[PDB]
Amino acid sequence: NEEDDLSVEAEIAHQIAESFSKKYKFPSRSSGIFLYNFEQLKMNLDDIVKEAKNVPGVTRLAHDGSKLPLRCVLGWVALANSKKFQLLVEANKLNKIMQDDLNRYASS
């Protein structure tokens, strides 16, 4: 159980570290898109990893060593933590995007 938590922690940290500066597209409130990456959260990696575990489905995927839905993880963590992201985003559209990705990544 302890060893499982360490493996999950390292797996999530691994995937977030590797994609830390990758820009993803999110829906703007007005029209169009804006870009965001983990780097812009201005959070330390330990806190980003903890917040990523609050995203439904991520712990299960990480436990299995599977690829995480990182656009959704970023969007959820940023929605939860970044006032700037919250003000920029069309949250109706973000919610549907995040749920679509969780559904895709929950497949077998």
PDB file of N, CA and C in Angstrom:
ATOM      1  N   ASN A   1       0.833  -1.199   0.000  1.00  0.00           N
ATOM      2  CA  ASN A   1       0.000   0.000   0.000  1.00  0.00           C
ATOM      3  C   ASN A   1       0.869   1.251   0.000  1.00  0.00           C
ATOM      4  N   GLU A   2       1.855   1.279   0.901  1.00  0.00           N
ATOM      5  CA  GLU A   2       2.826   2.368   0.905  1.00  0.00           C
ATOM      6  C   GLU A   2       3.623   2.376  -0.392  1.00  0.00           C
ATOM      7  N   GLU A   3       4.118   1.206  -0.802  1.00  0.00           N
ATOM      8  CA  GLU A   3       4.831   1.115  -2.069  1.00  0.00           C
ATOM      9  C   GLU A   3       3.939   1.518  -3.234  1.00  0.00           C
ATOM     10  N   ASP A   4       2.640   1.225  -3.153  1.00  0.00           N
ATOM     11  CA  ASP A   4       1.759   1.637  -4.237  1.00  0.00           C
ATOM     12  C   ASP A   4       1.640   3.153  -4.301  1.00  0.00           C
ATOM     13  N   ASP A   5       1.574   3.818  -3.144  1.00  0.00           N
ATOM     14  CA  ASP A   5       1.457   5.273  -3.150  1.00  0.00           C
ATOM     15  C   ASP A   5       2.714   5.918  -3.722  1.00  0.00           C
ATOM     16  N   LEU A   6       3.887   5.365  -3.399  1.00  0.00           N
ATOM     17  CA  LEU A   6       5.127   5.893  -3.959  1.00  0.00           C
ATOM     18  C   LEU A   6       5.167   5.713  -5.470  1.00  0.00           C
ATOM     19  N   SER A   7       4.685   4.569  -5.965  1.00  0.00           N
ATOM     20  CA  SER A   7       4.672   4.347  -7.405  1.00  0.00           C
ATOM     21  C   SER A   7       3.715   5.308  -8.094  1.00  0.00           C
ATOM     22  N   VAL A   8       2.535   5.520  -7.513  1.00  0.00           N
ATOM     23  CA  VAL A   8       1.588   6.464  -8.092  1.00  0.00           C
ATOM     24  C   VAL A   8       2.184   7.863  -8.108  1.00  0.00           C
ATOM     25  N   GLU A   9       2.811   8.265  -6.998  1.00  0.00           N
ATOM     26  CA  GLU A   9       3.400   9.594  -6.910  1.00  0.00           C
ATOM     27  C   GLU A   9       4.452   9.783  -7.999  1.00  0.00           C
ATOM     28  N   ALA A  10       5.326   8.788  -8.187  1.00  0.00           N
ATOM     29  CA  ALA A  10       6.386   8.906  -9.185  1.00  0.00           C
ATOM     30  C   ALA A  10       5.825   8.895 -10.596  1.00  0.00           C
ATOM     31  N   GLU A  11       4.743   8.136 -10.821  1.00  0.00           N
ATOM     32  CA  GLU A  11       4.181   8.077 -12.163  1.00  0.00           C
ATOM     33  C   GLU A  11       3.542   9.404 -12.542  1.00  0.00           C
ATOM     34  N   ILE A  12       2.760   9.990 -11.637  1.00  0.00           N
ATOM     35  CA  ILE A  12       2.147  11.275 -11.936  1.00  0.00           C
ATOM     36  C   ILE A  12       3.233  12.349 -12.091  1.00  0.00           C
ATOM     37  N   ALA A  13       4.182  12.395 -11.149  1.00  0.00           N
ATOM     38  CA  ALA A  13       5.262  13.379 -11.265  1.00  0.00           C
ATOM     39  C   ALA A  13       6.024  13.214 -12.570  1.00  0.00           C
ATOM     40  N   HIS A  14       6.255  11.972 -12.987  1.00  0.00           N
ATOM     41  CA  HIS A  14       6.953  11.723 -14.240  1.00  0.00           C
ATOM     42  C   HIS A  14       6.223  12.341 -15.419  1.00  0.00           C
ATOM     43  N   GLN A  15       4.918  12.102 -15.514  1.00  0.00           N
ATOM     44  CA  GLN A  15       4.180  12.569 -16.684  1.00  0.00           C
ATOM     45  C   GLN A  15       4.021  14.080 -16.675  1.00  0.00           C
ATOM     46  N   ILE A  16       3.798  14.662 -15.497  1.00  0.00           N
ATOM     47  CA  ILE A  16       3.662  16.113 -15.414  1.00  0.00           C
ATOM     48  C   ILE A  16       5.011  16.792 -15.660  1.00  0.00           C
ATOM     49  N   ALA A  17       6.096  16.246 -15.106  1.00  0.00           N
ATOM     50  CA  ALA A  17       7.419  16.818 -15.360  1.00  0.00           C
ATOM     51  C   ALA A  17       7.726  16.825 -16.852  1.00  0.00           C
ATOM     52  N   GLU A  18       7.421  15.715 -17.536  1.00  0.00           N
ATOM     53  CA  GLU A  18       7.775  15.610 -18.946  1.00  0.00           C
ATOM     54  C   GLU A  18       7.004  16.608 -19.798  1.00  0.00           C
ATOM     55  N   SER A  19       5.765  16.891 -19.430  1.00  0.00           N
ATOM     56  CA  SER A  19       4.917  17.792 -20.199  1.00  0.00           C
ATOM     57  C   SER A  19       4.755  19.150 -19.527  1.00  0.00           C
ATOM     58  N   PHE A  20       5.712  19.542 -18.683  1.00  0.00           N
ATOM     59  CA  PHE A  20       5.489  20.690 -17.813  1.00  0.00           C
ATOM     60  C   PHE A  20       5.306  21.979 -18.609  1.00  0.00           C
ATOM     61  N   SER A  21       6.038  22.149 -19.709  1.00  0.00           N
ATOM     62  CA  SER A  21       5.944  23.383 -20.478  1.00  0.00           C
ATOM     63  C   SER A  21       5.110  23.240 -21.746  1.00  0.00           C
ATOM     64  N   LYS A  22       4.559  22.056 -22.013  1.00  0.00           N
ATOM     65  CA  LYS A  22       3.768  21.856 -23.219  1.00  0.00           C
ATOM     66  C   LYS A  22       2.511  22.710 -23.143  1.00  0.00           C
ATOM     67  N   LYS A  23       2.266  23.490 -24.186  1.00  0.00           N
ATOM     68  CA  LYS A  23       1.078  24.331 -24.236  1.00  0.00           C
ATOM     69  C   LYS A  23      -0.102  23.507 -24.720  1.00  0.00           C
ATOM     70  N   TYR A  24      -1.216  23.613 -24.005  1.00  0.00           N
ATOM     71  CA  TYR A  24      -2.481  23.042 -24.425  1.00  0.00           C
ATOM     72  C   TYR A  24      -3.483  24.154 -24.692  1.00  0.00           C
ATOM     73  N   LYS A  25      -4.454  23.842 -25.554  1.00  0.00           N
ATOM     74  CA  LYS A  25      -5.508  24.769 -25.949  1.00  0.00           C
ATOM     75  C   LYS A  25      -6.707  24.655 -25.022  1.00  0.00           C
ATOM     76  N   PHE A  26      -7.244  25.795 -24.600  1.00  0.00           N
ATOM     77  CA  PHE A  26      -8.476  25.858 -23.841  1.00  0.00           C
ATOM     78  C   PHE A  26      -9.411  26.881 -24.432  1.00  0.00           C
ATOM     79  N   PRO A  27     -10.722  26.743 -24.183  1.00  0.00           N
ATOM     80  CA  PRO A  27     -11.708  27.652 -24.780  1.00  0.00           C
ATOM     81  C   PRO A  27     -11.779  28.985 -24.049  1.00  0.00           C
ATOM     82  N   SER A  28     -11.702  30.068 -24.818  1.00  0.00           N
ATOM     83  CA  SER A  28     -11.817  31.418 -24.298  1.00  0.00           C
ATOM     84  C   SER A  28     -13.280  31.790 -24.077  1.00  0.00           C
ATOM     85  N   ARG A  29     -13.505  32.744 -23.175  1.00  0.00           N
ATOM     86  CA  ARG A  29     -14.872  33.188 -22.917  1.00  0.00           C
ATOM     87  C   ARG A  29     -15.449  33.948 -24.100  1.00  0.00           C
ATOM     88  N   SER A  30     -14.646  34.808 -24.718  1.00  0.00           N
ATOM     89  CA  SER A  30     -15.133  35.655 -25.797  1.00  0.00           C
ATOM     90  C   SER A  30     -15.325  34.786 -27.026  1.00  0.00           C
ATOM     91  N   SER A  31     -14.217  34.478 -27.677  1.00  0.00           N
ATOM     92  CA  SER A  31     -14.204  33.590 -28.820  1.00  0.00           C
ATOM     93  C   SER A  31     -12.793  33.042 -28.909  1.00  0.00           C
ATOM     94  N   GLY A  32     -12.671  31.894 -29.552  1.00  0.00           N
ATOM     95  CA  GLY A  32     -11.353  31.364 -29.830  1.00  0.00           C
ATOM     96  C   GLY A  32     -10.774  30.611 -28.654  1.00  0.00           C
ATOM     97  N   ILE A  33      -9.448  30.626 -28.572  1.00  0.00           N
ATOM     98  CA  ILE A  33      -8.729  29.760 -27.663  1.00  0.00           C
ATOM     99  C   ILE A  33      -7.680  30.572 -26.919  1.00  0.00           C
ATOM    100  N   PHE A  34      -7.217  30.019 -25.809  1.00  0.00           N
ATOM    101  CA  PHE A  34      -5.987  30.471 -25.182  1.00  0.00           C
ATOM    102  C   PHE A  34      -5.148  29.262 -24.802  1.00  0.00           C
ATOM    103  N   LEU A  35      -3.845  29.502 -24.664  1.00  0.00           N
ATOM    104  CA  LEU A  35      -2.880  28.461 -24.343  1.00  0.00           C
ATOM    105  C   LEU A  35      -2.509  28.516 -22.868  1.00  0.00           C
ATOM    106  N   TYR A  36      -2.216  27.351 -22.305  1.00  0.00           N
ATOM    107  CA  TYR A  36      -1.802  27.261 -20.914  1.00  0.00           C
ATOM    108  C   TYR A  36      -0.913  26.038 -20.746  1.00  0.00           C
ATOM    109  N   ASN A  37       0.005  26.102 -19.782  1.00  0.00           N
ATOM    110  CA  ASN A  37       0.836  24.953 -19.447  1.00  0.00           C
ATOM    111  C   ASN A  37       0.988  24.863 -17.928  1.00  0.00           C
ATOM    112  N   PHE A  38       1.503  23.711 -17.461  1.00  0.00           N
ATOM    113  CA  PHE A  38       1.699  23.536 -16.019  1.00  0.00           C
ATOM    114  C   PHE A  38       2.606  24.617 -15.462  1.00  0.00           C
ATOM    115  N   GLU A  39       3.581  25.048 -16.259  1.00  0.00           N
ATOM    116  CA  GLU A  39       4.536  26.045 -15.790  1.00  0.00           C
ATOM    117  C   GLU A  39       3.841  27.323 -15.356  1.00  0.00           C
ATOM    118  N   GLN A  40       2.729  27.666 -16.005  1.00  0.00           N
ATOM    119  CA  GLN A  40       2.088  28.936 -15.716  1.00  0.00           C
ATOM    120  C   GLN A  40       1.334  28.927 -14.397  1.00  0.00           C
ATOM    121  N   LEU A  41       1.086  27.747 -13.824  1.00  0.00           N
ATOM    122  CA  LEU A  41       0.397  27.694 -12.546  1.00  0.00           C
ATOM    123  C   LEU A  41       1.188  28.385 -11.448  1.00  0.00           C
ATOM    124  N   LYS A  42       2.512  28.420 -11.564  1.00  0.00           N
ATOM    125  CA  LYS A  42       3.332  29.005 -10.515  1.00  0.00           C
ATOM    126  C   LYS A  42       3.092  28.276  -9.193  1.00  0.00           C
ATOM    127  N   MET A  43       2.873  26.965  -9.291  1.00  0.00           N
ATOM    128  CA  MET A  43       2.774  26.046  -8.166  1.00  0.00           C
ATOM    129  C   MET A  43       3.990  25.125  -8.204  1.00  0.00           C
ATOM    130  N   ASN A  44       4.391  24.620  -7.052  1.00  0.00           N
ATOM    131  CA  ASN A  44       5.496  23.675  -7.084  1.00  0.00           C
ATOM    132  C   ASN A  44       4.966  22.289  -7.461  1.00  0.00           C
ATOM    133  N   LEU A  45       5.863  21.465  -8.000  1.00  0.00           N
ATOM    134  CA  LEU A  45       5.467  20.189  -8.571  1.00  0.00           C
ATOM    135  C   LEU A  45       4.751  19.331  -7.541  1.00  0.00           C
ATOM    136  N   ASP A  46       5.197  19.381  -6.286  1.00  0.00           N
ATOM    137  CA  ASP A  46       4.582  18.544  -5.262  1.00  0.00           C
ATOM    138  C   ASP A  46       3.108  18.892  -5.111  1.00  0.00           C
ATOM    139  N   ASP A  47       2.796  20.190  -5.098  1.00  0.00           N
ATOM    140  CA  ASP A  47       1.393  20.592  -4.995  1.00  0.00           C
ATOM    141  C   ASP A  47       0.613  20.299  -6.270  1.00  0.00           C
ATOM    142  N   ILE A  48       1.234  20.398  -7.444  1.00  0.00           N
ATOM    143  CA  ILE A  48       0.525  20.049  -8.668  1.00  0.00           C
ATOM    144  C   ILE A  48       0.190  18.562  -8.668  1.00  0.00           C
ATOM    145  N   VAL A  49       1.134  17.723  -8.228  1.00  0.00           N
ATOM    146  CA  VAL A  49       0.882  16.285  -8.193  1.00  0.00           C
ATOM    147  C   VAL A  49      -0.248  15.968  -7.213  1.00  0.00           C
ATOM    148  N   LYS A  50      -0.248  16.613  -6.044  1.00  0.00           N
ATOM    149  CA  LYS A  50      -1.335  16.393  -5.088  1.00  0.00           C
ATOM    150  C   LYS A  50      -2.670  16.797  -5.698  1.00  0.00           C
ATOM    151  N   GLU A  51      -2.706  17.935  -6.397  1.00  0.00           N
ATOM    152  CA  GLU A  51      -3.964  18.373  -6.991  1.00  0.00           C
ATOM    153  C   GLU A  51      -4.392  17.444  -8.113  1.00  0.00           C
ATOM    154  N   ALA A  52      -3.433  16.905  -8.874  1.00  0.00           N
ATOM    155  CA  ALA A  52      -3.769  15.966  -9.935  1.00  0.00           C
ATOM    156  C   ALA A  52      -4.464  14.720  -9.395  1.00  0.00           C
ATOM    157  N   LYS A  53      -4.117  14.293  -8.182  1.00  0.00           N
ATOM    158  CA  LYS A  53      -4.805  13.149  -7.580  1.00  0.00           C
ATOM    159  C   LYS A  53      -6.269  13.441  -7.252  1.00  0.00           C
ATOM    160  N   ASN A  54      -6.645  14.722  -7.139  1.00  0.00           N
ATOM    161  CA  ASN A  54      -8.029  15.146  -6.894  1.00  0.00           C
ATOM    162  C   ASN A  54      -8.869  15.066  -8.166  1.00  0.00           C
ATOM    163  N   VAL A  55      -8.242  14.907  -9.329  1.00  0.00           N
ATOM    164  CA  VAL A  55      -8.971  14.733 -10.594  1.00  0.00           C
ATOM    165  C   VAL A  55      -9.507  13.309 -10.674  1.00  0.00           C
ATOM    166  N   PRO A  56     -10.810  13.111 -10.863  1.00  0.00           N
ATOM    167  CA  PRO A  56     -11.360  11.749 -10.838  1.00  0.00           C
ATOM    168  C   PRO A  56     -10.750  10.896 -11.940  1.00  0.00           C
ATOM    169  N   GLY A  57     -10.270   9.709 -11.559  1.00  0.00           N
ATOM    170  CA  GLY A  57      -9.724   8.740 -12.487  1.00  0.00           C
ATOM    171  C   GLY A  57      -8.208   8.725 -12.603  1.00  0.00           C
ATOM    172  N   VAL A  58      -7.529   9.776 -12.152  1.00  0.00           N
ATOM    173  CA  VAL A  58      -6.090   9.883 -12.384  1.00  0.00           C
ATOM    174  C   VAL A  58      -5.326   8.865 -11.540  1.00  0.00           C
ATOM    175  N   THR A  59      -5.698   8.720 -10.264  1.00  0.00           N
ATOM    176  CA  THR A  59      -4.976   7.781  -9.407  1.00  0.00           C
ATOM    177  C   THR A  59      -5.025   6.371  -9.982  1.00  0.00           C
ATOM    178  N   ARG A  60      -6.200   5.952 -10.454  1.00  0.00           N
ATOM    179  CA  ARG A  60      -6.363   4.626 -11.042  1.00  0.00           C
ATOM    180  C   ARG A  60      -5.445   4.444 -12.240  1.00  0.00           C
ATOM    181  N   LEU A  61      -5.450   5.415 -13.154  1.00  0.00           N
ATOM    182  CA  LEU A  61      -4.573   5.345 -14.319  1.00  0.00           C
ATOM    183  C   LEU A  61      -3.106   5.298 -13.907  1.00  0.00           C
ATOM    184  N   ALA A  62      -2.706   6.149 -12.965  1.00  0.00           N
ATOM    185  CA  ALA A  62      -1.302   6.191 -12.559  1.00  0.00           C
ATOM    186  C   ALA A  62      -0.890   4.882 -11.904  1.00  0.00           C
ATOM    187  N   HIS A  63      -1.781   4.308 -11.095  1.00  0.00           N
ATOM    188  CA  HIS A  63      -1.501   3.021 -10.471  1.00  0.00           C
ATOM    189  C   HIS A  63      -1.210   1.953 -11.517  1.00  0.00           C
ATOM    190  N   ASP A  64      -1.917   1.995 -12.646  1.00  0.00           N
ATOM    191  CA  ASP A  64      -1.694   1.030 -13.716  1.00  0.00           C
ATOM    192  C   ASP A  64      -0.535   1.406 -14.628  1.00  0.00           C
ATOM    193  N   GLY A  65       0.090   2.560 -14.421  1.00  0.00           N
ATOM    194  CA  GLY A  65       1.168   2.979 -15.293  1.00  0.00           C
ATOM    195  C   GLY A  65       0.718   3.479 -16.643  1.00  0.00           C
ATOM    196  N   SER A  66      -0.532   3.897 -16.764  1.00  0.00           N
ATOM    197  CA  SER A  66      -1.102   4.313 -18.032  1.00  0.00           C
ATOM    198  C   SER A  66      -0.907   5.804 -18.263  1.00  0.00           C
ATOM    199  N   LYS A  67      -0.988   6.192 -19.531  1.00  0.00           N
ATOM    200  CA  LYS A  67      -0.951   7.605 -19.869  1.00  0.00           C
ATOM    201  C   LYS A  67      -2.126   8.338 -19.225  1.00  0.00           C
ATOM    202  N   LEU A  68      -1.849   9.529 -18.680  1.00  0.00           N
ATOM    203  CA  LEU A  68      -2.856  10.379 -18.073  1.00  0.00           C
ATOM    204  C   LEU A  68      -3.431  11.360 -19.097  1.00  0.00           C
ATOM    205  N   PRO A  69      -4.733  11.795 -18.928  1.00  0.00           N
ATOM    206  CA  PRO A  69      -5.301  12.870 -19.775  1.00  0.00           C
ATOM    207  C   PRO A  69      -4.783  14.233 -19.334  1.00  0.00           C
ATOM    208  N   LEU A  70      -3.609  14.614 -19.844  1.00  0.00           N
ATOM    209  CA  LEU A  70      -2.920  15.761 -19.258  1.00  0.00           C
ATOM    210  C   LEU A  70      -3.590  17.095 -19.577  1.00  0.00           C
ATOM    211  N   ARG A  71      -4.227  17.236 -20.750  1.00  0.00           N
ATOM    212  CA  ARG A  71      -4.997  18.456 -21.012  1.00  0.00           C
ATOM    213  C   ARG A  71      -6.109  18.628 -19.981  1.00  0.00           C
ATOM    214  N   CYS A  72      -6.748  17.521 -19.596  1.00  0.00           N
ATOM    215  CA  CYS A  72      -7.806  17.583 -18.592  1.00  0.00           C
ATOM    216  C   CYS A  72      -7.215  17.835 -17.213  1.00  0.00           C
ATOM    217  N   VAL A  73      -6.112  17.168 -16.893  1.00  0.00           N
ATOM    218  CA  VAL A  73      -5.484  17.371 -15.594  1.00  0.00           C
ATOM    219  C   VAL A  73      -5.058  18.826 -15.442  1.00  0.00           C
ATOM    220  N   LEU A  74      -4.422  19.384 -16.472  1.00  0.00           N
ATOM    221  CA  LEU A  74      -4.049  20.794 -16.412  1.00  0.00           C
ATOM    222  C   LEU A  74      -5.283  21.679 -16.255  1.00  0.00           C
ATOM    223  N   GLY A  75      -6.289  21.472 -17.097  1.00  0.00           N
ATOM    224  CA  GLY A  75      -7.483  22.296 -16.991  1.00  0.00           C
ATOM    225  C   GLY A  75      -8.140  22.227 -15.622  1.00  0.00           C
ATOM    226  N   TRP A  76      -8.184  21.029 -15.042  1.00  0.00           N
ATOM    227  CA  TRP A  76      -8.849  20.881 -13.744  1.00  0.00           C
ATOM    228  C   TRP A  76      -8.031  21.551 -12.651  1.00  0.00           C
ATOM    229  N   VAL A  77      -6.718  21.316 -12.659  1.00  0.00           N
ATOM    230  CA  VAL A  77      -5.855  21.919 -11.646  1.00  0.00           C
ATOM    231  C   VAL A  77      -5.882  23.443 -11.767  1.00  0.00           C
ATOM    232  N   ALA A  78      -5.832  23.947 -13.009  1.00  0.00           N
ATOM    233  CA  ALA A  78      -5.863  25.396 -13.217  1.00  0.00           C
ATOM    234  C   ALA A  78      -7.209  26.001 -12.834  1.00  0.00           C
ATOM    235  N   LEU A  79      -8.302  25.336 -13.204  1.00  0.00           N
ATOM    236  CA  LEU A  79      -9.627  25.786 -12.777  1.00  0.00           C
ATOM    237  C   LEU A  79      -9.715  25.842 -11.255  1.00  0.00           C
ATOM    238  N   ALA A  80      -9.102  24.860 -10.584  1.00  0.00           N
ATOM    239  CA  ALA A  80      -9.146  24.796  -9.134  1.00  0.00           C
ATOM    240  C   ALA A  80      -8.226  25.804  -8.452  1.00  0.00           C
ATOM    241  N   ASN A  81      -7.187  26.288  -9.139  1.00  0.00           N
ATOM    242  CA  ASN A  81      -6.111  26.994  -8.457  1.00  0.00           C
ATOM    243  C   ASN A  81      -5.736  28.353  -9.027  1.00  0.00           C
ATOM    244  N   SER A  82      -5.972  28.580 -10.313  1.00  0.00           N
ATOM    245  CA  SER A  82      -5.489  29.789 -10.985  1.00  0.00           C
ATOM    246  C   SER A  82      -6.661  30.735 -11.245  1.00  0.00           C
ATOM    247  N   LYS A  83      -6.635  31.900 -10.592  1.00  0.00           N
ATOM    248  CA  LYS A  83      -7.647  32.917 -10.862  1.00  0.00           C
ATOM    249  C   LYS A  83      -7.562  33.401 -12.305  1.00  0.00           C
ATOM    250  N   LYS A  84      -6.343  33.532 -12.837  1.00  0.00           N
ATOM    251  CA  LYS A  84      -6.187  33.997 -14.212  1.00  0.00           C
ATOM    252  C   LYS A  84      -6.828  33.029 -15.196  1.00  0.00           C
ATOM    253  N   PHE A  85      -6.575  31.735 -15.023  1.00  0.00           N
ATOM    254  CA  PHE A  85      -7.200  30.729 -15.868  1.00  0.00           C
ATOM    255  C   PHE A  85      -8.722  30.763 -15.715  1.00  0.00           C
ATOM    256  N   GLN A  86      -9.209  30.864 -14.478  1.00  0.00           N
ATOM    257  CA  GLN A  86     -10.653  30.894 -14.251  1.00  0.00           C
ATOM    258  C   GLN A  86     -11.317  32.040 -15.003  1.00  0.00           C
ATOM    259  N   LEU A  87     -10.684  33.211 -15.013  1.00  0.00           N
ATOM    260  CA  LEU A  87     -11.266  34.360 -15.687  1.00  0.00           C
ATOM    261  C   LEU A  87     -11.211  34.217 -17.201  1.00  0.00           C
ATOM    262  N   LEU A  88     -10.217  33.497 -17.718  1.00  0.00           N
ATOM    263  CA  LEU A  88     -10.074  33.366 -19.163  1.00  0.00           C
ATOM    264  C   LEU A  88     -10.998  32.316 -19.758  1.00  0.00           C
ATOM    265  N   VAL A  89     -11.385  31.324 -18.990  1.00  0.00           N
ATOM    266  CA  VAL A  89     -11.958  30.112 -19.569  1.00  0.00           C
ATOM    267  C   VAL A  89     -13.479  30.221 -19.672  1.00  0.00           C
ATOM    268  N   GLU A  90     -14.005  29.619 -20.743  1.00  0.00           N
ATOM    269  CA  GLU A  90     -15.425  29.322 -20.892  1.00  0.00           C
ATOM    270  C   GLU A  90     -15.652  28.008 -20.160  1.00  0.00           C
ATOM    271  N   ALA A  91     -16.233  28.081 -18.959  1.00  0.00           N
ATOM    272  CA  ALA A  91     -16.260  26.904 -18.099  1.00  0.00           C
ATOM    273  C   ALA A  91     -17.288  25.867 -18.547  1.00  0.00           C
ATOM    274  N   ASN A  92     -18.388  26.276 -19.191  1.00  0.00           N
ATOM    275  CA  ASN A  92     -19.278  25.274 -19.772  1.00  0.00           C
ATOM    276  C   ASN A  92     -18.502  24.382 -20.732  1.00  0.00           C
ATOM    277  N   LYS A  93     -17.775  25.001 -21.663  1.00  0.00           N
ATOM    278  CA  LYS A  93     -17.049  24.237 -22.670  1.00  0.00           C
ATOM    279  C   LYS A  93     -15.909  23.452 -22.043  1.00  0.00           C
ATOM    280  N   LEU A  94     -15.225  24.035 -21.060  1.00  0.00           N
ATOM    281  CA  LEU A  94     -14.142  23.309 -20.407  1.00  0.00           C
ATOM    282  C   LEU A  94     -14.675  22.052 -19.727  1.00  0.00           C
ATOM    283  N   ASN A  95     -15.828  22.155 -19.059  1.00  0.00           N
ATOM    284  CA  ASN A  95     -16.364  20.992 -18.355  1.00  0.00           C
ATOM    285  C   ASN A  95     -16.640  19.847 -19.310  1.00  0.00           C
ATOM    286  N   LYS A  96     -17.200  20.155 -20.477  1.00  0.00           N
ATOM    287  CA  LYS A  96     -17.523  19.111 -21.440  1.00  0.00           C
ATOM    288  C   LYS A  96     -16.251  18.500 -22.014  1.00  0.00           C
ATOM    289  N   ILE A  97     -15.229  19.328 -22.267  1.00  0.00           N
ATOM    290  CA  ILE A  97     -13.950  18.822 -22.762  1.00  0.00           C
ATOM    291  C   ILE A  97     -13.312  17.891 -21.742  1.00  0.00           C
ATOM    292  N   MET A  98     -13.300  18.300 -20.474  1.00  0.00           N
ATOM    293  CA  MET A  98     -12.662  17.482 -19.450  1.00  0.00           C
ATOM    294  C   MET A  98     -13.398  16.161 -19.281  1.00  0.00           C
ATOM    295  N   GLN A  99     -14.730  16.203 -19.260  1.00  0.00           N
ATOM    296  CA  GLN A  99     -15.478  14.961 -19.121  1.00  0.00           C
ATOM    297  C   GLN A  99     -15.264  14.053 -20.327  1.00  0.00           C
ATOM    298  N   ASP A 100     -15.182  14.628 -21.531  1.00  0.00           N
ATOM    299  CA  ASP A 100     -14.935  13.798 -22.711  1.00  0.00           C
ATOM    300  C   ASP A 100     -13.595  13.080 -22.597  1.00  0.00           C
ATOM    301  N   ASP A 101     -12.559  13.798 -22.159  1.00  0.00           N
ATOM    302  CA  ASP A 101     -11.245  13.184 -22.012  1.00  0.00           C
ATOM    303  C   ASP A 101     -11.246  12.129 -20.911  1.00  0.00           C
ATOM    304  N   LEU A 102     -11.892  12.406 -19.775  1.00  0.00           N
ATOM    305  CA  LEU A 102     -11.958  11.376 -18.742  1.00  0.00           C
ATOM    306  C   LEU A 102     -12.646  10.129 -19.261  1.00  0.00           C
ATOM    307  N   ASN A 103     -13.722  10.301 -20.028  1.00  0.00           N
ATOM    308  CA  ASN A 103     -14.423   9.153 -20.593  1.00  0.00           C
ATOM    309  C   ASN A 103     -13.522   8.387 -21.550  1.00  0.00           C
ATOM    310  N   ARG A 104     -12.766   9.108 -22.379  1.00  0.00           N
ATOM    311  CA  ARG A 104     -11.882   8.422 -23.318  1.00  0.00           C
ATOM    312  C   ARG A 104     -10.811   7.627 -22.595  1.00  0.00           C
ATOM    313  N   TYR A 105     -10.210   8.215 -21.562  1.00  0.00           N
ATOM    314  CA  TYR A 105      -9.107   7.595 -20.844  1.00  0.00           C
ATOM    315  C   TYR A 105      -9.579   6.511 -19.880  1.00  0.00           C
ATOM    316  N   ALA A 106     -10.874   6.478 -19.550  1.00  0.00           N
ATOM    317  CA  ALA A 106     -11.410   5.398 -18.730  1.00  0.00           C
ATOM    318  C   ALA A 106     -11.629   4.114 -19.520  1.00  0.00           C
ATOM    319  N   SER A 107     -11.601   4.179 -20.849  1.00  0.00           N
ATOM    320  CA  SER A 107     -11.799   2.993 -21.674  1.00  0.00           C
ATOM    321  C   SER A 107     -10.772   1.916 -21.345  1.00  0.00           C
ATOM    322  N   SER A 108     -10.995   0.694 -21.819  1.00  0.00           N
ATOM    323  CA  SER A 108     -10.061  -0.394 -21.554  1.00  0.00           C
ATOM    324  C   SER A 108      -8.810  -0.314 -22.436  1.00  0.00           C
TER     325      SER A 108
END
